Symmetry: C3
Subunit: 92 residues, 3 copies
């Protein structure tokens, strides 16, 4: 499982979340950050969908002008859902 992070311009949040949702990725976390105003988006997905999710972020946030932001990919060792205690892939 992977954690996909994206730092994007605030006005793209709505489009980003819509394109993610169209490939089935929900469960986003959003934080307001300052880039030296941006929005950070974090989503922990199954390895089987990282390519689709990265591409849907690039599809929606790419305006084309300077400052569209970056995306970062990192491994996640384990994911636990609190309510049930399900672990790994079925915790997504």
């Amino acid at each position: 499982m992977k954690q996909v992070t994206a730092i994007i311009k605030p006005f793209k949040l709505d489009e980003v979340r819509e394109s993610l949702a169209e490939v089935g990725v929900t469960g986003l976390t959003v934080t307001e950050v300052k880039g030296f105003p941006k929005v950070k988006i974090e989503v922990v997905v199954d390895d089987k969908v990282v390519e689709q999710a990265v591409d849907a972020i690039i599809k929606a946030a790419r305006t084309g002008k300077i400052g569209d932001g970056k995306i970062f990919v990192q491994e996640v060792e384990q994911v636990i859902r609190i309510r049930t205690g399900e672990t790994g892939p079925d915790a997504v």
Copy 2:
């Protein structure tokens, strides 16, 4: 060393903190974040983050579960990632001396 992250409901913060502290885990970092749910959409959440030695992970995870679980949708999730190095600014202690 492992970073333990959890995204929990806001008002479960105090309990989680106290339950961690019972298992010896302090040094929490707290960030206010949004999650997505008339059905409300934009929701308050709180992200907690702590870096622990490898052997403490299981009981750190155990303690967060005990304190936050209600058995309803919205209780949140925990993730655990690897950290390559930890440095304590004040002294320069690295690794397990730094946790």
Copy 3:
């Protein structure tokens, strides 16, 4: 590629950022965070938060030790609560505008 993260006292941010520029690191991401009366969604709560700032930078492996060194020297006051730095691997970095990776 490494993600360097530091959690520092809030009045040290300009100084840290100046130190980092001297070793060539400039694109910082800054988050306001808390450690252990305040208002929350309109109601007063008695709490014992301390405000901190998280700084995050993603750099080339070769640059880490000089980034780390630059933060330590600028952020230290010598007091308790100075904070901590940690390093993580980043599997892939994509620039949105272009597709550079």
